[model samples]
Target: LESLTHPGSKVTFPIDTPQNPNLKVFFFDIDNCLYKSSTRIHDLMQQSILRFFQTHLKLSPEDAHVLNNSYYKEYGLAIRGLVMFHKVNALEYNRLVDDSLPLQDILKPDIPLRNMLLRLRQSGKIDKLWLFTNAYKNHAIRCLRLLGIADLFDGLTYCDYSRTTLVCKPHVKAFEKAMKESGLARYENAYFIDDSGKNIETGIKLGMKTCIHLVENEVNEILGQTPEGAIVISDILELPHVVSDLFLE
Candidate 1:
């Protein structure tokens, strides 16, 4: 899954049908989607990102806060704003903020979550399970390992800041790139679940069966990622039931 962040590298998938289409792929969002956002790990990440804006970029604290709000609403990520405005070396920013997170201290083993994912792998309802994240590979891997479910994924489609251009979730130009690298050819045989509403909306536009993994007790409306008729779930364990009809009997 070491692919570039561009549509030239992308392949398209198909829509769901009544026929025996069993090669469906499941795409799960990392970070806030996999685990409960209440764990405050995301809070720490926001802190790190904000510090990068203030300390590394030398933006005033007031400027940093306003930009964060702007970036979240418009671009889905702060790094993208920095890329456009500051000409940041994306990898350097990733290392400074994302790779520097205190993941070990924040996340712990979630046997229930791991068992839930393993059941999906064993059920054979889906052909493959892939992690799709806006975070860089290092950050995504570290978070997955901390959750003790890194091996549960067949592959990862993550943000590559090293590219001359970058593409992350939410503000994505084309999400087919993520599926292309996943070896998907049928859009009908795919599903995407993410906390970011914008990313989910993009996936829906890409023809994937899209879902928004909302945090319980927390409200998120960035870019209004949740559209009408979108599938919505608050827990990972609830996912099996969401796609039960798609499973072959």
Candidate 2:
């Protein structure tokens, strides 16, 4: 459980304890993984990021679009490349790109998804339920609250934009830090899910027992292809059928 407040939001959520040690650890990706990609929230977020590049970095519209794609391809995150090359202020970048999203107007409470997570929490098959996201904490928390699963997660491991060098998914350092913060000493007992195949591959390489790739309503041409070693699924609600052992009494 975490109790923290940023400029305009105060949020706290319960951290669940394992019924016993050696239970499985679950790390869920936010954004496209938690919510339907049909919402086009990803597209909205990208537009905001592009605007930030143009406005904050003083790039022309053409340059901003080109640079954003180049950076994301090379550095895993556009902000990481911006930080290293342009010395962009990461926190301010998040404030403008992530905080500015009209998540309230875009997202609504997802009842079935909420109920699935609630049952997973109560199933006693979980040791930890941590959100593993590349987004900043503000976006992650706000998304969860809107999804009506704010209180279900144990903790969140988000990009620390306050740092001079941002850490995010598909990076070994980010995964290692997430494990440490979640009290996970190793990866073999972990269960992971994400909409990005690249991110899921990172978890699989780390040796998580189960890593599911979510391609539900996916739009990314490259990532939509199934990642090797991942049990691909189109819907998060298929968890019970896909990994029934986790839901066993």
Candidate 3:
């Protein structure tokens, strides 16, 4: 609420979006939002997470596997459950699981993605662009740089693991924090896209005009569960078409 963490020097939140057409702002999630998590980048993330659980958490290989999936399903993030029940240090766990991954190697830049974001920025219709992620700053930046779209976003609101207790995706506080950080006035002009149905539901409740659920492989499972106003899509590239009216010609 009170400008958390003194607003890191590197953190930039641009408040202006040229008004020409339909959409005013575009908010996106990292991880599975931009690319499939089952890809190379996600594989590396999984490897790091597994290692952390097995080595630092002292969990058996089999038990770690089950816990990782179960915790992620129940808690939105594995660290959340760990911190709540096991007294695990959230900051330490983030560093161990997120910082351990070799992101640059796995998340290679995509020329098309760079071009797409550039076009979006140039489209006078959209005023602002922000990243909403459940990942730590280091991890988020690493992934963005790897995708060659780091400069495209106006702001990034990521999970601050350093906080003794922090709420992430699907939490109203997280969405509220993003709104405050981005200086967004009308929630109706906000456009939110995430891979998780719960996160999209939160955005809808927060009054976002367009809520997009990016589900590639698991569409069926998440199909009917999405909120009333949310639109489901399988590809990030399809965004312009889905909300074409929101952009300028």
Error of 3 at 233 (Å): 1.6
Query: Residues 1-249, candidate 1, lDDT per residue (tens digit)?
Result: 223232212222221114344567888888788788788877887788888889877889888888887876877678877888778888888888878877667777678887777777777777788778888877776666667676677778887777644687765453666667777777767888887777777777767765555555545765464565567777776776777654433
| lDDT (CA) per prediction | 0.71, 0.80, 0.74
Writing each residue's lDDT as its tens digit, candidate 2 over 129-236 gives: 888888887788888877667767788888888877677888889999888778786698799998888788889988999999888865365443556789988888
What's the CA RMSD of model 3 in angstroms? 6.4
Between candidates 1 and 2, the one scoring higher on TM-score is 2
TM-score of candidate 1 to 2 decimals: 0.84
Question: Which residue pairs overlap in candidate 1's backbone?
Answer: 13-186, 13-187, 14-186, 14-187, 14-188, 15-188, 16-188, 197-225, 198-225
In terms of lDDT, which candidate is strongest? 2
| Model 2 accuracy (lDDT, Cα) | 0.80
Worst 10 residues of 1 by lDDT: 8-17
Q: Which residue window of length 10 is worst by lDDT in model 2?
A: 1-10
Better of 2 and 3 by TM-score: 2
User: Better model by lDDT, 1 or 2?
Assistant: 2
Each prediction's TM-score versus the true structure = 0.84, 0.89, 0.82
